[PDB]
Amino acid sequence: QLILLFSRTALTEKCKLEEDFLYMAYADIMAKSCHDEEVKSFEEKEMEKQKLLYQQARLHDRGAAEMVLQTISASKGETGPMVAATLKLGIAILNGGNSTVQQKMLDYLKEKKDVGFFQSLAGLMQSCSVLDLNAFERQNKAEGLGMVTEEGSGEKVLQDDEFTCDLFRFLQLLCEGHNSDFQNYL
Amino acid sequence: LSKKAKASTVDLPIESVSLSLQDLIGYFHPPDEHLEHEDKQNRLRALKNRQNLFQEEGMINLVLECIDRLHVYSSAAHFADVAGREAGESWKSILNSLYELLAALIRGNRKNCAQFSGSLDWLISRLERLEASSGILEVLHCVLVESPEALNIIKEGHIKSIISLLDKHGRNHKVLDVLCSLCVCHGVAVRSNQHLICDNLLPGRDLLLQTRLVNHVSSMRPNIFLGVSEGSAQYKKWYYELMVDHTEPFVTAEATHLRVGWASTEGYSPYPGGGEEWGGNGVGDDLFSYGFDGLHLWSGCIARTVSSPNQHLLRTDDVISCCLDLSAPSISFRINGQPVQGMFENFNIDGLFFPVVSFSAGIKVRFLLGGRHGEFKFLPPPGYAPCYEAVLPKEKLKVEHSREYKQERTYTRDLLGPTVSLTQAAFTPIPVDT
Amino acid sequence: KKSSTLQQLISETMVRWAQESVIEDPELVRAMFVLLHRQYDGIGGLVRALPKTYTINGVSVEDTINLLASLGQIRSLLSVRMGKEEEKLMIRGLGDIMNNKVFYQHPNLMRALGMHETVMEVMVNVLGGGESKEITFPKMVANCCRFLCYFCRISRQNQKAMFDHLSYLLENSSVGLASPAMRGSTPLDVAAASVMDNNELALALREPDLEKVVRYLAGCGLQSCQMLVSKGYPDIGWNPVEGERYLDFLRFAVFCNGESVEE
Amino acid sequence: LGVAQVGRMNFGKDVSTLKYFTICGLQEGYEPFAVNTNRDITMWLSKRLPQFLQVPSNHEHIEVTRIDGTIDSSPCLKVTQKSFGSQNSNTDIMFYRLSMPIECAEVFSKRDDYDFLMQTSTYYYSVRIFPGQEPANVWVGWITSDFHQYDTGFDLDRVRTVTVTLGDEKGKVHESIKRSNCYMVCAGESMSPGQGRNNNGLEIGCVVDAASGLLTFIANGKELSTYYQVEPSTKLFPAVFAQATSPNVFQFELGRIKNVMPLSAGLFKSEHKNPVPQCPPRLHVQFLSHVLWSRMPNQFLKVDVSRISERQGWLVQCLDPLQFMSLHIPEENRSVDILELTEQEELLKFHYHTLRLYSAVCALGNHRVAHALCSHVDEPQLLYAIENKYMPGLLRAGYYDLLIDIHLSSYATARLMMNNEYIVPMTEETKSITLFPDENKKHGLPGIGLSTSLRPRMQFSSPSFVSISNECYQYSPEFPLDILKSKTIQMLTEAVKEGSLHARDPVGGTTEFLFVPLIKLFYTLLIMGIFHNEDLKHILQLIEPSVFKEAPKEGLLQMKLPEPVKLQMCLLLQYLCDCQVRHRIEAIVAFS
Amino acid sequence: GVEIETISPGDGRTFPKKGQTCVVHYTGMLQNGKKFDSSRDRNKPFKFRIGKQEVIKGFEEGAAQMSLGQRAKLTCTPDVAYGATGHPGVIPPNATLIFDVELLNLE
Incomplete structure (x- = not known):
């Protein structure tokens, strides 16, 4: 029911993807449930893989694969916390190159004929940031002046390193295992 | 046709216009609710796209022009005189369809409802017309619901016209809905509209239904039935007294009700006539009863102040003497022995009269019926006879409810049908012609 | 045994309802799951x-x-x-707040209550209402801007908080520049106060916001003043009155605390 | 029940009272009609007194045609019999009246001219008796609201009249007042010239002088001798009584004559200065009918009657107050009990939307409008509507919302806007606060405790209308919060027990109608924070007995509730969680 | 412009004097008979000061002429009560008010 509510909200007509605290919290909860993360034995590694598969199944059996695509499509290429939370959940359910999730994701896209998904992906890629030398120099001038730093890491330079990495890891996970169909579809 | 060309040479595509107006309404029909969520969303998106394309091509003004050119004719008969008979027949349907199409074009679209602001003033100008009131009201409701800019241009004259719509066309909850939408839009309240609606509608107390708490009023009467008829052995003068042992002026927020006097019956039925069985009505509210509350003479629900020494509402330890004279219709009262300077005269005498008292909660009164039943504190006026002398020689005088139904357990409640006419009350010896 | 705690009781009840029946009301589903998340995230309540x-x-x-009232x-x-009456209520309330001593003594409480946000959006409503038809309730924009300038002057952190709205303030920068006696009471003046004598904010000030002001100044240099020619002033080709006001903000952006910000 | 027939009718609310249910009806599986009803079933009976109701479009005998007025013809209303001549046709006198009345002035004064038409108060309507209809069977004139006399044989001598004669102290009658419900004349006697009606239908003209109360009649252009003088404030309805001798009976004509105002100018307020005659859709022909039901009251006044002694007479005693809400229809000068709207759908809908309009005009802190509305909807009516169990569900929900909007919504919103901010003063009371009430780490009941955080001040104004001061228009009108608390707790306690049995007769007809208004009012009171200590303990026990027990019975959380009720219970739980968060913050500040 | 009719007699001696507060229950009706105000509904007595223009002139004069413990009917013409403007939302323009006033206590 929760995933169905989140999917209906994404499928509802809106001019913009409004920030939803409930979604931004429960998506994080589901992603943490999915990952749940000295040589290990082969049996230990296999148990870990099988537990990860079951944890991913608890969600993608209930329609999380469709919801993470619907939210990205409704984003319309606007970077935000909602998109970041959706991408993290997609990565969580896609870790290990989950073939069942890949097939579900491709089948939904092919059936719905969703163009907004790819348009939003292109928009997010364009909105992704890079190093800004001018901002770096301004921060250096401010620090040398003697004023206190608002943020230690200087978030202005390379605005969101996590978002870009998650966005491209999502795409890599989509094509892992030499998934020719989705590789051509992209 | 307006420039008066021949009706034959003018090509008026009535049937094509009607068919296209129906197809267009079907085309802009809103999605149904029972459909699946995704399908409903797709249909809503298609409808919004259609509305946007139509408004960008300016199809709203085309419909407005058709409506304006059709309202030049006052009625279907006028349109059938100017244009053809079939055109006159279809005039009303085309006008309704055009308004429905306009409502479908602007419904749910913020941009369209914002663009219709300039035409709102022209729209409310024809609200009074009977052939367009419903459609104009629907369009106005859609615009006011959707566009906040509409409320900024609705003025006092428009609000007063909408209010007078209620007065001229009767009660219609759609006008109330429009007025509600005039107040608050999207959580923002328009205080000027609120004040105008309040000050122009509420103080009249003539359109909206009015509510008030009324104390329950009951009536109790003796058994006797006094009537007058030609060749009947019934005495025309009667007299009885009522004294108030206790009365609380204000048991609730409303004043305590206590009236005494005479009441009559409709025809010869023992059932009291002209009044409701239950409610807040008492002695004097109808034209079949005659009352006195210590300050006013009550008859027909109109009260007139009557003079008396030391005027006061009926208090504790007040003796009221009621006199009824049927020879010449006259009901007179005397409070505490002094006469009351007023009387009822020339009323209907084709019925049976009986003493009656009406009251609400908070009383303690006692009938002084004369003789063994009661003792008169004051001597009856000459001629008048005590009321106990009218009891039939077989029954017993008792004071019971005037109406049939009282307070008791529901399954033990006695349901009573119509009662037989009490024609034996007046004994007229019928002659056997010989 | 029983839940014995409100948290446990709510956590049981929400799940029990949801597993008992499919809820047709999205509002009910949302409320249920918000409540469940609050029960399972008690730390976040304190965090907020x-x-x-x-x-x-x-x-x-x-x-x-009194300040809270x-x-x-x-x-x-x-x-x-x-x-008209909301104008009076807004002005009397703002005046009472400025007269109250707590407004000066406790700037952090003012920032936590978000008074600047409330005044900001109150002025936003008026500004968005009727731009082409000339701004209505100009005395409101003046009072709101004076309050915001005072808020900026009270404390350095308040100035930083107001700096976050420099983008919109520069969008609505041509509200009352031509009108005199509103000098120092315009969104452009609020923006200037947001960066007055602050090296940290001057260095954080970007390029596009400067480009906006430059474009406005170019427009003022190219085109005459519509409101002034409507009142009858001679039609010169350019707008000195608005140009000077736009130049003052650039002055405050480029020069700070005696030295010139090179960037 | 027939003539002189008495019967008793048992719904089997108490099974023991049914005499033959066990011998035949219990084993067969049949259920008593009142098996699961907490309150008695309402009895409806055939109304004895006929009333005026609009002529139905499907009527088998009467047809009404609304002829529109042309440039040369006034608007007309024509009454004709569709079934005349054929079998089953009824040849009885039928009483017709117009919907709206003409009201006389409150104080009686002691080419047509346009100024005279603007200063005049005389109104006119005329009736055309179509040729072929017997004029002796047609009566024309005015009637009042009291006219409920249905007689197959009607004569002008049989009308109900009374003459109140108020006299001086000596007894000389200085004034005599004739009062009657019918002021009408006969066309048969009006036919003075003779043979002037067969060529063209006779026209009685009725003119009423609202400033003087003088009712005079003109027929065929000449004034009749009969005239009626009415008392001030009398509301007169145009009326025609006719027995049909033709397919066409008569015609209401709403025109005007020289120096007289049209009838619409007096009927409607907006047309007060409009010489053009009009027939707005509100005006319509009504007829006296017997097809109406009457609602037996659920409870009657308890009156004790007994003969004290021979000298003391018969004692009539009534000491227990009873009171009902009356809904007044303005145009028809009528009044009905509001509980009779359970079967009158149109009035119920209109009144529900009127309540919504009342709640909307005073929305979002319109304190002046709230004060004005306190005149129309009073405290006693609000309390009676809240507590009454037979109220229709729509009106119940409307009145609950009206009470909340007029008296409580402002402060509720004031406290909700400042709920997420914690400005706690540093005082000894603040220092005394601790996370846990005692040594045992037992959570205290939510809400109960000592809270020192600054909270908005609650202020109310007395809604008086004789005072000329305007300082009252700030702050919402005052209400008895203590009585409201006690009755809210009482009704919640009753509702929890009643709904647990799944009775077939909930208050308002549905579980939603029973619970949503009540829980909404309780949530508003909780937000305002009026509940203190023991009241909060009791109402928390109502929500959940076991968990909130202080150191079987089912609380509100486990009763198989509808979704709207579930949403409000979620709101209450949210508020309790907020109270816990506030307590935690206040304890942290105490430690700090 | 105020005529007073006695409904219940009072003591007839303790009339209100200047600089006192009169404690009354009143019930106001329009001339047509519709109730618009009542202190008994609010269940809490009305207090006003003589000569300090707290209430309307008609009510002031009526209460001044009444005596302690007396219940009287007050009829106020539209020139001593809300004039021609009327009270917005409650009293229509040019309305005559009828008041049922009881002088409970003088203090």
Whole structure:
């Protein structure tokens, strides 16, 4: 029911993807449930893989694969916390190159004929940031002046390193295992 | 046709216009609710796209022009005189369809409802017309619901016209809905509209239904039935007294009700006539009863102040003497022995009269019926006879409810049908012609 | 046994309802799951609450109560359309707040209550209402801008908080520049106060916001003043009155505390 | 029940009272009609007194045609019999009246001219008796609201009249007042010239002088001798009584004559200065009918009657107050009990939307409008509507919302806007606060405790209308919060027990109608924070007995509730969680 | 412009004097008979000061002429009560008010 509510909200007509605290919290909860993360034995590694598969199944059996695509499509290429939370959940359910999730994701896209998904992906890629030398120099001038730093890491330079990495890891996970169909579809 | 060309040479595509107006309404029909969520969303998106394309091509003004050119004719008969008979027949349907199409074009679209602001003033100008009131009201409701800019241009004259719509066309909850939408839009309240609606509608107390708490009023009467008829052995003068042992002026927020006097019956039925069985009505509210509350003479629900020494509402330890004279219709009262300077005269005498008292909660009164039943504190006026002398020689005088139904357990409640006419009350010896 | 705790009781009840029946009301589903998340995230409640927690001395209680009453009136005026009487209520409340001593003594409490946000959006409503038809309720924009400038001057952190709205303030920068006696009471003046004498904010100031002001100044240099020619002033080709006001903001952006910000 | 027939009718609310249910009806599986009803079933009976109701479009005998007025013809209303001549046709006198009345002035004064038409108060309507209809069977004139006399044989001598004669102290009658419900004349006697009606239908003209109360009649252009003088404030309805001798009976004509105002100018307020005659859709022909039901009251006044002694007479005693809400229809000068709207759908809908309009005009802190509305909807009516169990569900929900909007919504919103901010003073009371009430780490009941955080001040104004001061228009009108608390707790306690049995007769007809208004009012009171200590303990026990027990019975959380009720219970739980968060913050500040 | 009719007699001696507060229950009706105000509904007595223009002139004069413990009917013409403007939302323009006033206590 929760995933169905989140999917209906994404499928509802809106001019913009409004920030939803409930979604931004429960998506994080589901992603943490999915990952749940000295040589290990082969049996230990296999148990870990099988537990990860079951944890991913608890969600993608209930329609999380469709919801993470619907939210990205409704984003319309606007970077935000909602998109970041959706991408993290997609990565969580896609870790290990989950073939069942890949097939579900491709089948939904092919059936719905969703163009907004790819348009939003292109928009997010364009909105992704890079190093800004001018901002770096301004921060250096401010620090040398003697004023206190608002943020230690200087978030202005390379605005969101996590978002870009998650966005491209999502795409890599989509094509892992030499998934020719989705590789051509992209 | 307006420039008066021949009706034959003018090509008026009535049937094509009607068919296209129906197809267009079907085309802009809103999605149904029972459909699946995704399908409903797709249909809503298609409808919004259609509305946007139509408004960008300016199809709203085309419909407005058709409506304006059709309202030049006052009625279907006028349109059938100017244009053809079939055109006159279809005039009303085309006008309704055009308004429905306009409502479908602007419904749910913020941009369209914002663009219709300039035409709102022209729209409310024809609200009074009977052939367009419903459609104009629907369009106005859609615009006011959707566009906040509409409320900024609705003025006092428009609000007063909408209010007078209620007065001229009767009660219609759609006008109330429009007025509600005039107040608050999207959580923002328009205080000027609120004040105008309040000050122009509420103080009249003539359109909206009015509510008030009324104390329950009951009536109790003796058994006797006094009537007058030609060749009947019934005495025309009667007299009885009522004294108030206790009365609380204000048991609730409303004043305590206590009236005494005479009441009559409709025809010869023992059932009291002209009044409701239950409610807040008492002695004097109808034209079949005659009352006195210590300050006013009550008859027909109109009260007139009557003079008396030391005027006061009926208090504790007040003796009221009621006199009824049927020879010449006259009901007179005397409070505490002094006469009351007023009387009822020339009323209907084709019925049976009986003493009656009406009251609400908070009383303690006692009938002084004369003789063994009661003792008169004051001597009856000459001629008048005590009321106990009218009891039939077989029954017993008792004071019971005037109406049939009282307070008791529901399954033990006695349901009573119509009662037989009490024609034996007046004994007229019928002659056997010989 | 029983839950014995409100948290456990809610956590049981929400799940029990959801597994008992399919809920047809999205609002009910949302409320249920919000409540469940609150029960399972008790730390987040404190995390949100503490930044909005302020302590005061006993001597300041009545002044704080009066300030909160004025702020409540201002907040409640958000839900009504602006009119002549709302103008008076807004002005009297803002004046009471500026007269109150707590407004000066406790800038952090003012920032936590978000008074600048409330005044900001109150002025936003008026500004967005009727731009082409000339701004209505100009005395409101003036009073709101004066309050915001005072808020900026009170403390350095307040100036940083106001700096976050420099983008919109520069968008609505041509509100009352031509009108005199509103000098120092315009969104452009608020923007200038947001960066006055602050190296940290001057260095953080970007390029596009400067480009906006440059474009406005170019427009003022190319085109005459519509409101002034409507009043009958001779039609010169350019707008000195608005040009000077636009130049003052650039002055404040480029020059700070005696030295010139090279960037 | 027939003539002189008495019967008793048992719904089997108490099974023991059914005499033959066990011998035949219990084993067969049949259920008593009142098996699961907490309150008695309402009895409806055939109304004895006929009333005026609009002529139905499907009527088998009467047809009404609304002829529109042309440039040369006034608007007309024509009454004709569709079934005349054929079998089953009824040849009885039928009483017709117009919907709206003409009201006389309150104080009686002691080419047509346009100024005279603007200063005049005389109104006119005329009736055309179509040729072929017997004029002796047609009566024309005015009637009042009291006219409920249905007689197959009607004569002008049989009308109900009374003459109140108020006299001086000596007894000389200085004034005599004739009062009657019918002021009408006969066309048969009006036919003075003779043979002037067969060529063209006779026209009685009725003119009423609202400033003087003088009712005079003109027929065929000449004034009749009969005239009626009415008392001030009398509301007169145009009326025609006719027995049909033709397919076409008569015609209401709403024109005007020289120096007289049209009838619409007096009927409607907006047309007060409009010489053009009009027939707005509100005006319509009504007829006296017997097809109406009457609602037996659920409870009657308890009156004790007994003969004290021979000298003391018969004692009539009534000491227990009873009171009902009356809904007044303005145009028809009528009044009905509001509980009779359970079967009158149109009035119920209109009144529900009127309540919504009342709640909307005073929305979002319109304190002046709230004060004005306190005149129309009073405290006693609000309390009676809240507590009454037979109220229709729509009106119940409307009145609950009206009470909340007029008296409580402002402060509720004031406290909700400042709920997420914690400005706690540093005092000894603040220092005394601790996370846990005692040594045992037992959570205290939510809400109960000592809270020192600054909270908005609650202030109310007395809604008086004789005072000329305007300082009252700030702050919402005052209400008895203590009585409201006690009755809210009482009704919640009753509702929890009643709904647990799944009775077939909930208050308002549905579980939603029973619970949503009540829980909404309780949530508003909780937000306002009026509940203190023991009241909060009791109402928390109502929500959940076991968990909130202080150191079987089912609380509100486990009763198989509808979704709207579930949403409000979620709101209450949210408020309790907020109270816990506030307590935690206040304890942290105490430690600090 | 105020005529007073006695409904219940009072003591007849303790009339209100200047600089006192009169405690009354009143019930106001329009001339047509519709109730618009009542202190008994609010269940809490009305207090006003003589000569300090707290209430309307008609009510002031009526209460001044009444005596302690007396219940009287007050009829106020539209020139001593809300004039021609009327009270917005409650009293229509040019309305005559009828008041049922009881002088409970003088203090």
